[PDB]
Design a protein around this ligand. Structure first.
Ligand SMILES: *[C@@H]1O[C@H](CO)[C@@H](O[C@@H]2O[C@H](CO)[C@@H](O[C@@H]3O[C@H](CO[C@H]4O[C@H](CO[C@H]5O[C@H](CO)[C@@H](O)[C@H](O)[C@@H]5O)[C@@H](O)[C@H](O[C@H]5O[C@H](CO)[C@@H](O)[C@H](O)[C@@H]5O)[C@@H]4O)[C@@H](O)[C@H](O[C@H]4O[C@H](CO[C@H]5O[C@H](CO)[C@@H](O)[C@H](O)[C@@H]5O)[C@@H](O)[C@H](O)[C@@H]4O[C@H]4O[C@H](CO)[C@@H](O)[C@H](O)[C@@H]4O[C@H]4O[C@H](CO)[C@@H](O)[C@H](O)[C@@H]4O)[C@@H]3O)[C@H](O)[C@H]2NC(C)=O)[C@H](O)[C@H]1NC(C)=O
Ligand SMILES: *[C@@H]1O[C@H](CO)[C@@H](O[C@@H]2O[C@H](CO)[C@@H](O[C@@H]3O[C@H](CO[C@H]4O[C@H](CO)[C@@H](O)[C@H](O[C@H]5O[C@H](CO)[C@@H](O)[C@H](O)[C@@H]5O)[C@@H]4O)[C@@H](O)[C@H](O[C@H]4O[C@H](CO)[C@@H](O)[C@H](O)[C@@H]4O[C@H]4O[C@H](CO)[C@@H](O)[C@H](O)[C@@H]4O[C@H]4O[C@H](CO)[C@@H](O)[C@H](O)[C@@H]4O)[C@@H]3O)[C@H](O)[C@H]2NC(C)=O)[C@H](O)[C@H]1NC(C)=O
Ligand SMILES: *[C@@H]1O[C@H](CO)[C@@H](O[C@@H]2O[C@H](CO)[C@@H](O[C@@H]3O[C@H](CO[C@H]4O[C@H](CO)[C@@H](O)[C@H](O[C@H]5O[C@H](CO)[C@@H](O)[C@H](O)[C@@H]5O)[C@@H]4O)[C@@H](O)[C@H](O[C@H]4O[C@H](CO)[C@@H](O)[C@H](O)[C@@H]4O)[C@@H]3O)[C@H](O)[C@H]2NC(C)=O)[C@H](O)[C@H]1NC(C)=O
Ligand SMILES: *[C@@H]1O[C@H](CO)[C@@H](O[C@@H]2O[C@H](CO)[C@@H](O)[C@H](O)[C@H]2NC(C)=O)[C@H](O)[C@H]1NC(C)=O
Ligand SMILES: *[C@@H]1O[C@H](CO)[C@@H](O)[C@H](O)[C@H]1NC(C)=O
Ligand SMILES: *[C@@H]1O[C@H](CO)[C@@H](O)[C@H](O)[C@H]1NC(C)=O
Ligand SMILES: *[C@H]1O[C@H](CO)[C@@H](O)[C@H](O)[C@@H]1O
Length: 549
């Protein structure tokens, strides 16, 4: 390959500084078999106008190559139309002034999984080398704003696996260097096992005689329970929560003291996480990437953050937090005690149908900013000292003001919200919610009658149309799954896990087919308690469904 442009060489350190912060074009070129095969339509270039406008400096471009080969051994030819598609999307990004990182993505487990017992490691190496030679050839003449990343989250359980991941980095470096063009001075992102901080620290080794400018990329989706909505965890922000996060990043940095580091994916998704906890978490994560000189890139699958059809960011507070890391954020406080028998959140003003409208006081973590103004979502700035007062860290809304937004009898649902403008940092949003205890169309079912598939139960949402968690208890008191949640306090004991065991959609709460098969195996009627926000206690805002055996 021969290039006719110029190339502005950049060090890995300067590249990693320049890309902070990044955003992922998730579930697109990484979707299988085609870019519109999952939830997102065909990629359109205005999507990158929105990303640029929000303050991101870079776009990570996950690409899954598995379903775009037109031959197998020994050439492993990639469809030139797919290589052209990847090339053109990269051009969409860099022509708007955004840096790019492009990779090999779900290939990692679809065919390149070195941990499977039947894996032919020779063929994996061979196909991987051909793939990166062809990618590197097609992309050889891209500017220095385009970096290459070895492979996404490669499955890796043992040090023997970790040597094979090191070999991936070497095969990759050799392929792109033979491809030529500008690749010898192109910034690259090398990877460790599962892209996990500990596996990387344990087994990653710099490729001998490396000459590309290089950075290490890892992903961070901890703590599991909050990020994946496991075991009823719906809070984040205690001293130990922060210590676990700060430690995980610091032990990684402590093993790679002079290596530029890219945090290539993270996300407390607005779809499943509670906002006040989510904002404390994103705030603390950004603070920690700044402590340990890491550049973060948020994961967004198309439904998490940006709506690409409208340009609306579903969670504007998180985006502000991530794109303005030099600024201190004032945040709504929230319960962070797992032993607390009630959970509160200053990201919300909650009112129950059929109760009187009362004053509501929301504690905030001001972090030495001042409150400048508040504005509702209809465009009205509220009147300070009439519509709200400030006392210390507390923001109080009087009952007479709130009674202009809801009453004892108005319908349950989402009402206007309030955007709080502070001296500096992000502008948090307080969502008014009129809520009641949801009802279900059905209260029991035989498990035998409804197996082979998920169980969808129609529901009348009354307030937030989201599920917080599901408790599952056999008739004799044994937990349906995961006995160890008995140590997780009043809101965690006997609770089950999002997507694995339960879900929800617009009209239904859902028990998965695996959940149903667990009941049949237990041989015992099981009570499912669907639990909703607010989590004022363990029973009030909840409804039961019994699977019979
Ligand atoms: C969705 O479904 C779930 C599951 O079906 C529903 O949950 C269930 O709700 C019912 C109803 O609320 C609960 O019943 C209560 O149980 C109380 C004891 O609970 C504890 O023990 C049980 C049993 O444990 C054994 O069995 C299990 C097998 O499953 C074994 O594993 C275990 O080892 C034991 O062997 C436990 O199951 C229970 O666990 C739950 O809670 C713990 C604690 O957090 C959780 O960790 C668990 O995960 C689980 O969630 C717990 O360990 C029992 O005390 C209580 O009986 C009193 O109250 C009754 C109702 O009183 C109200 O109504 C009356 C009018 O009818 C009013 O007068 C009254 O004031 C009140 O308003 C009374 O009818 C009854 O007589 C008892 O009254 C006494 O106590 C009252 C409360 O103080 C007093 O007000 C009374 O005056 C009276 O006091 C007098 O008597 C006592 C005792 O004699 C004296 O001490 C006292 O001094 C005084 O003289 C009730 O039976 C059930 O526990 C719960 N089950 C589960 C699994 O959660 C859920 O509601 C539903 N949700 C929805 C939204 O629909
Ligand atoms: C505070 O309160 C605020 C006020 O209530 C609240 O704001 C609301 O926030 C929600 C969520 O962020 C917004 O909902 C989205 O609305 C999108 C459409 O918006 C346009 O049309 C609306 C109706 O007329 C207008 O209200 C809106 O006007 C506003 O915005 C303009 C742009 O700034 C502005 O110019 C206007 O003046 C005005 O300010 C706008 O014109 C809608 O597209 C979006 O739906 C997607 O996301 C849902 C999940 O949130 C999905 O369920 C849904 O299916 C859509 O996702 C699909 O499409 C995506 C894009 O392609 C894909 O990536 C997805 O995967 C998914 O794909 C499926 O469907 C495709 C077909 O569509 C198909 O191709 C795929 O195969 C797949 O099947 C969402 O509903 C709402 O607009 C906001 N309201 C207002 C008034 O602003 C705010 O959230 C509150 N703040 C906080 C912090 O709580
Ligand atoms: C670089 O990255 C690595 C990987 O993350 C970091 O190493 C890890 O550090 C943490 C914190 O110091 C360690 O956690 C502790 O683990 C001990 C048990 O350690 C023993 O068992 C391990 C399991 O196989 C083994 O890996 C260890 O081997 C190391 O240590 C020996 C002896 O020093 C040494 O000879 C080896 O060569 C290895 O270096 C070891 O044999 C456990 O007892 C601890 O519990 C205490 O602390 C926690 C902290 O909160 C507390 O909660 C408990 O109550 C208890 O008080 C603790 O969990 C982890 O084991 C280390 N992992 C490895 C593989 O070494 C390393 O710190 C990073 N370096 C820098 C500079 O940041
Ligand atoms: C902020 O708001 C909380 C809640 O109203 C206040 O805490 C309460 O203080 C009174 C004492 O005046 C106690 O009786 C309550 O039990 C407290 N409630 C709690 C701790 O949840 C707090 O004082 C307020 N701070 C201000 C106004 O500066
Ligand atoms: C593994 O694949 C290579 C290349 O496709 C092939 O030559 C080799 O014989 C295979 N080995 C086994 C054990 O199947
Ligand atoms: C409850 O029933 C399950 C059903 O398999 C059984 O495994 C468990 O031992 C039982 N526990 C008690 C306390 O009865
Ligand atoms: C969370 O904190 C609030 C404080 O406003 C309480 O009212 C609630 O019961 C929970 O403790």
């Amino acid at each position: 390959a021969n290039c006719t442009g110029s190339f502005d060489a950049i060090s890995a350190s300067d590249f990693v500084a320049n890309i902070n912060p990044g955003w992922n074009l998730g579930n697109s070129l990484d979707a299988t078999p085609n870019e519109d095969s999952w939830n997102n339509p065909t990629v359109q270039e205005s999507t990158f106008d929105y990303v640029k406008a929000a303050g991101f400096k870079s776009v990570r471009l996950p690409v899954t190559w598995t379903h775009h080969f037109t031959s197998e051994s020994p050439d492993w030819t990639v469809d030139p139309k797919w290589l052209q598609r990847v090339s053109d999307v990269i051009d969409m990004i860099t022509s708007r002034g955004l840096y790019t990182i492009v990779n090999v993505h779900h290939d990692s487990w679809e065919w390149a999984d070195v941990t499977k017992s039947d894996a032919n490691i020779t063929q994996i190496e061979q196909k991987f080398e051909k793939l990166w030679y062809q990618i590197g050839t097609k992309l050889a003449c891209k500017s220095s704003m385009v970096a290459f990343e070895t492979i996404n989250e490669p499955p890796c359980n043992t040090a023997e696996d970790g040597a094979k991941i090191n070999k991936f980095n070497e095969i990759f470096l050799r392929a792109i260097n033979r491809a030529g063009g500008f690749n010898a001075k192109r910034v690259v992102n090398l990877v460790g096992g599962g892209m996990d901080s500990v596996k990387t620290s344990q087994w990653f080794k710099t490729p001998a005689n490396i000459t590309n400018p290089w950075a290490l990329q890892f992903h961070f989706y901890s703590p599991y329970d909050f990020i994946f909505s496991a075991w009823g965890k719906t809070i984040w922000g205690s001293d130990s929560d922060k210590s676990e996060l700060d430690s995980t990043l610091g032990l990684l940095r402590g093993n790679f003291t002079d290596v530029p580091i890219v945090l290539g994916e993270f996300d407390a998704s607005p779809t499943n996480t509670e906002p006040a906890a989510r904002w404390k978490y994103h705030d603390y994560l950004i603070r920690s990437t700044k402590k340990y000189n890491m550049s973060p890139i948020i994961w967004d699958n198309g439904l998490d953050h940006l709506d690409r059809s409208s340009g609306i960011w579903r969670d504007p507070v998180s985006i502000e937090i991530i794109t303005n890391g030099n600024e201190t954020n004032s945040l709504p406080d929230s319960t962070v005690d797992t032993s607390a028998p009630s959970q509160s959140s200053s990201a919300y003003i909650y009112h129950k149908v059929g109760t009187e409208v009362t004053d509501q006081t929301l504690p905030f973590i001001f972090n030495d900013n001042t409150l400048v103004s508040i504005q509702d979502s209809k465009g009205t700035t509220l009147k300070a000292d009439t519509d709200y007062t400030v006392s210390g860290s507390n923001i109080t809304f009087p009952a007479s003001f709130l009674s202009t937004y809801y009453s004892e009898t108005s319908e349950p649902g989402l009402l206007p919200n309030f955007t709080l403008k502070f001296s500096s940092g992000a502008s948090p949003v307080v969502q008014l919610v009129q809520w009641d205890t949801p009802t279900l169309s059905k209260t029991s079912a035989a498990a035998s009658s409804i197996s082979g598939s998920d169980l969808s139960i129609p529901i009348t949402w009354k307030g937030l149309p989201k599920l917080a968690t599901v408790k599952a208890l056999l008739n004799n008191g044994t937990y349906l799954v995961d006995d160890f949640t008995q140590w997780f306090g009043p809101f965690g004991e006997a609770r089950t896990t999002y997507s694995n065991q339960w879900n929800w959609d617009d009209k239904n709460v859902i028990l998965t087919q695996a959940t149903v098969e667990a009941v049949v195996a237990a041989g015992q009627d099981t009570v499912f308690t669907f639990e909703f926000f607010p989590r004022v206690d363990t029973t009030t805002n909840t409804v039961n469904f019994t699977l019979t055996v």
